[PDB]
C-alpha cells in the first residue's frame, strides 16, 4: 500500500466527522480505493466512507488489506500536518503500523501509527426507493440541527407538498423551521414523517466542511440517509428513527 493525497486538509476533515461517532474502525483498502463502514457504540447509526483511487496521485494497493485504527490516534497525528502539505500513506510488511509522511514545497515530517485488530462484518445496506429526498446547503442543515438541539433531544421531520418541516417540543417551548422548493431541491413521491435523535444529527453535521451541499433521504420505518458528496467519493450516515 502506497497512496498520496494532494491536500492533507481533506483527510483531517473526514476524521473530524467520523471520530466522535466511531472510536475504532477498519479502513478497507482495494484497487478501487479506501473505504470504511462502521456502527456507533449503540448500533443506532452507521457510517460509510469512500475515497476512490481517483483522489490519489501515485495510488497503489496490490492486494486487499484491512487497517484497524483508533480514529483519535489517527486524528492527533493528522493534526501535525499543515493544510497545504502532501500526505503519503504507506503500509508495508505487517498490518502492525501505518506510516504517514507530510511534505511541502519545504520539509518532511513522518509518523507511525500503531494499528490494532478489529473484526470483519458486513452489515448489508439494503439499497432502495426513498419516498422523499431533500438537498440543501450543508451550512443550513448544520444551523438548524445546532439550534434545535439547544431546545430538545429529538426532532420530527415531515415531508409533503407544504415543503420539509423540522419540529421540536422541549421545556423552553416548541417550534419548527420549514423549507420549500426554492438552493433547496425536494422530491417526494409520498409524504413521510419520522422522528430522530438530534444528538446524532449534530454529530453528522461535523461533516459540513467536506461539501457545500447535503442530501437527506427518507421512507417510513427506514433509516434516514444523510449524504455528503465529494470528488472521488462520499461520506454517508444512516440513522434509525425513534
Amino acid at each position: 500500500l502506497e497512496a498520496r493525497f494532494q491536500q492533507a486538509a481533506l483527510l483531517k476533515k473526514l476524521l473530524d466527522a467520523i471520530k466522535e461517532l466511531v472510536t475504532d474502525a477498519n479502513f478497507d483498502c482495494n484497487d478501487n480505493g479506501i473505504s470504511l463502514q462502521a456502527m456507533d457504540s449503540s448500533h443506532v447509526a452507521l457510517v460509510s466512507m469512500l475515497i476512490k483511487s481517483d483522489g490519489f496521485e501515485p495510488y497503489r494497493c496490490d492486494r486487499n488489506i484491512a487497517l484497524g485504527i483508533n480514529l483519535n490516534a489517527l486524528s492527533k497525528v493528522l493534526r501535525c500536518a499543515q493544510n497545504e502539505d502532501l500526505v503519503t500513506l504507506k503500509a508495508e510488511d505487517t498490518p502492525e503500523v501505518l506510516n504517514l509522511v507530510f511534505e511541502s514545497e519545504d520539509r518532511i515530517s513522518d509518523y507511525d501509527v500503531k494499528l490494532m485488530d478489529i473484526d470483519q462484518e458486513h452489515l448489508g445496506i439494503p439499497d432502495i426507493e426513498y419516498d422523499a429526498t431533500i438537498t440543501m446547503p450543508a451550512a443550513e442543515f448544520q444551523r438548524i440541527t445546532r439550534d434545535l438541539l439547544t431546545l430538545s433531544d429529538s426532532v420530527t421531520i415531515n415531508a409533503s407538498k407544504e415543503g420539509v418541516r423540522f419540529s421540536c417540543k422541549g421545556d423552553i417551548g416548541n417550534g419548527s423551521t420549514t423549507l420549500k422548493q426554492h438552493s433547496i431541491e425536494i422530491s417526494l413521491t409520498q409524504a413521510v414523517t419520522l422522528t430522530f435523535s438530534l444528538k446524532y444529527l449534530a454529530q453528522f453535521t461535523k461533516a459540513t466542511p467536506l461539501a457545500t451541499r447535503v442530501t437527506l433521504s427518507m421512507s417510513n420505518d427506514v433509516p434516514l440517509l444523510v449524504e455528503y458528496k465529494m470528488e472521488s467519493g462520499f461520506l454517508r450516515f444512516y440513522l434509525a428513527p425513534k
Partner: peptide, 10 residues
C-alpha cells in the same frame, strides 16, 4: 424510545 438499524433490515 429509540430502536436500532437491526430493527430496520440491516
Amino acid at each position: 424510545i429509540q430502536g436500532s438499524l437491526m430493527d430496520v433490515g440491516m
